Amino acid sequence: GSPRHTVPQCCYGFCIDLLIKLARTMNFTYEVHLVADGKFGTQERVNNSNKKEWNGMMGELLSGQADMIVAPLTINNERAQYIEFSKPFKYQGLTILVKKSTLWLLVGLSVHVVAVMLYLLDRFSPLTLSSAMWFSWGVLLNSFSARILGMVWAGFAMIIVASYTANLAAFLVLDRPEERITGINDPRLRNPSDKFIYATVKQSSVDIYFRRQVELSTMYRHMEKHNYESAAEAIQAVRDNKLHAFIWDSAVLEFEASQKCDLVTTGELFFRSGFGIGMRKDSPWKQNVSLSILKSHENGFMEDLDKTWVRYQETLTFENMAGVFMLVAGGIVAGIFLIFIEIAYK
């Protein structure tokens, strides 16, 4: 994305203020900079000489270009196998980001038949015609021999509106499409397809964590299709539903849910680990940093930084009666037209 553009800029935030804090703790200076290319770093062969290397922040750390990684690095096994880690300052896991009549008209034709047959039943065996018509108006919605079948139809009308109340409460209350995934334990994602598009950040710790486990191998052959550079591109791709799910940490997705109310996490939570500080080998800057982080944990300064960024956040009945509402608003014109008919007839 950059032909040649490398500038100084203003950087701030959570780990920046943590860096200012332990810079206040013991006295030292520093040089804050960023990575050349936006990767955490994975153990990967370069395809000349058949040799493993690291890239990203770890590739700049081991090459001497960097000496301390104050950044959200995910502690796992293999990254601890080469360098030393302090105790983690943030504890979280992993989760998934997603984006979160006809027969009545037949009964109306039936009562159009019923009103005619009841008036003919009253006509055969002994303003009255309009009286029985207005009786049919009062019966078909429910706002002596024919009145027996009329009250039978009133029982029909109550049992029909009872079934209508029951299945509307069904359709919008009880049953529900499974919008949730139930986490990593979804059997449909075990053998996925083009309808479940989900992946991870390219060369992140999620890649190694899903490359290790043998019961998650098939998804690893699917999530290698859409590996993304930044998490912002993942938010952008799920934002237009080009994806269908995303695998990322807890507090970052909770902050994005506080940003955007449609970006919603899911129920499950696995891989309980912690963001710590990426450090070098045996160095005199090892015990001091862990003691200072633990001193920041024992007081509420971690909770103060939560108040800065982590804790910091940012029916009505018009759904199926919207068309009914428009029909009620439009029927006033038909009633005025019937007033025109009643004027023009006399």
């Binding site: 207005w134 633990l294 009945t317 009914v324 009633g335 019937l338």
Partner: protein, 302 residues
């Protein structure tokens, strides 16, 4: 003394059992990496009415217009209309105009589907399982003074513990109030919370989570899951300068990223766990009818 006294004074090699991590222990021992998120914890036990009113005025105006076509139900059509919204059928009036009868039938269909949607709204409100938290963090004003609020309550800790040292290094006045409210046993405080001889309790997170996950009835529910709290971890304590540290840490981090740690969490932790009451809505009913009779007493001035 204790675990630290047996580790540092070289009668043991490592401390495998459950143990917190704080500053002076990290001075005297060199801990491993943590493996379970175990901080600290505290255990205890709009737009419908306006537009529907405007449509009600529209229906009354059309009733006035049908009277202009054609008895004394000019202003009494509202007592028909909003009385037949609820379909309790107070005897009001029988309309004469045909367009008025069609309008009453359409509005009655609207009232039937409105009460059906209201029953569905009550069912959807009946779906949700609401939770209450009378104390929402360690920085509560209830914890500041039991004279600040009207019931003088109580809160328990454990003696000779790391939680007491964290309180003494973070909140000395809270340690002064905890000095009044000490006790000894964990299960003693459990029985005091079940019978009611204790109100609050302050300890670590996962121990109280496991005690809540195996209790019958599940009265004891925590406050969150460790969000306004210390948020540290349990690990393994070794002697300072032991060569076992790297190997033990690599073995633990291998045990993390395979689900075998999750299998042991399944093996040793349990993840289990109303009536007819609407008295808030009933008090609203009584207060709105008292306001309505007050409005009638205001209109009685003529």
């Amino acid at each position: 003394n204790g675990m630290i006294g047996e580790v540092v004074y070289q009668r043991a090699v490592m401390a495998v059992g459950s143990l917190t991590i704080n500053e002076e222990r990290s001075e005297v021992v060199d801990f491993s990496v943590p493996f379970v998120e175990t901080g600290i914890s505290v255990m205890v036990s709009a737009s419908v009415w306006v537009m529907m009113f405007v449509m009600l005025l529209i229906v009354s105006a059309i009733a006035v217009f049908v009277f202009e076509y054609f008895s004394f139900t000019i202003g009494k059509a509202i007592w028909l209309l909003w009385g037949l919204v609820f379909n309790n059928s107070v005897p009001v009036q029988n309309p004469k105009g045909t367009t008025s009868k069609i309008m009453v039938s359409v509005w009655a269909f609207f009232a039937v589907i409105f009460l059906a949607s209201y029953t569905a709204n009550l069912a959807a409100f009946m779906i949700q399982e609401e939770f209450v938290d009378q104390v929402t963090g360690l920085s509560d004003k209830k914890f500041q003074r039991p004279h600040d609020y009207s019931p003088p309550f109580r809160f328990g800790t454990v003696p000779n513990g790391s939680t007491e040292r964290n309180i003494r290094n973070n909140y000395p006045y809270m340690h002064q109030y905890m000095t009044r409210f000490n006790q000894r046993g964990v299960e003693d405080a459990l029985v005091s919370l079940k019978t009611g001889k204790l109100d609050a309790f302050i300890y670590d997170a996962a121990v109280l989570n496991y005690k809540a996950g195996r209790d019958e009835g599940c009265k004891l529910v925590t406050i969150g899951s460790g969000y306004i709290f210390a948020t540290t971890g349990y690990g393994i304590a070794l002697q300072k300068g032991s060569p076992w540290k790297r190997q033990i840490d690599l073995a633990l981090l291998q045990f993390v990223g395979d689900g075998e740690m999750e299998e042991l969490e399944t093996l040793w932790l349990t993840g289990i766990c109303s009536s007819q009451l609407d008295i808030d809505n009933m008090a609203g009913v009584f207060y709105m009818l008292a306001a309505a009779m007050a409005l009638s007493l205001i209109t009685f001035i003529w």
